[PDB]
Amino acid sequence: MRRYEVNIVLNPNLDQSQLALEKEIIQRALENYGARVEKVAILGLRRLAYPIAKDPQGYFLWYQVEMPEDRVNDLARELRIRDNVRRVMVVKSQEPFL
Template sequence: MRQYEVMYVLRPDLEEEKVKSNVARYSDVVTNYGGEISKLQEMGKRRLAYEINKFREGYYVLMNFKANSDAVAEAERLMKINDDVIRFMFVRDEK
């Protein structure tokens, strides 16, 4: 298993429970594929550097985890098809 970091930005107009369900969904994907989450940081609503899909703000979430590539591929697939996620980036940590 390798160490990964993902930051994703959710739409700012989501209700709090919808934000929590999205965070739980992606955390569950990692754990269901045998990974372990080392850090989950909900950074809250912040201003975007530039407009994305007519949004000037977004709800930022940072997650560090250890998993295999299947978990990353599945989480990435789910983020691509979810309209609540306006941006995401996975980075493999080389530590």
């Protein structure tokens, strides 16, 4: 098992309601791939390094999880496919939240 930080960028045009749902769905997907979600945070709107879908902004969601390394890729694939998901980045935790 490995601990990861899942960084998700969502459509900046979604409202409080839509963001909450995507956040819940994404969390359900993580667990579906054997993950145990330790922490979640809504980081908010940020100016992307490069526009995605013609929009220079994105809404950031963050998750800290522990899951089988062998399921991360498939998980990353599924999430990138979501309509409201603009960017997915799963990295190995360095200084995990307690």
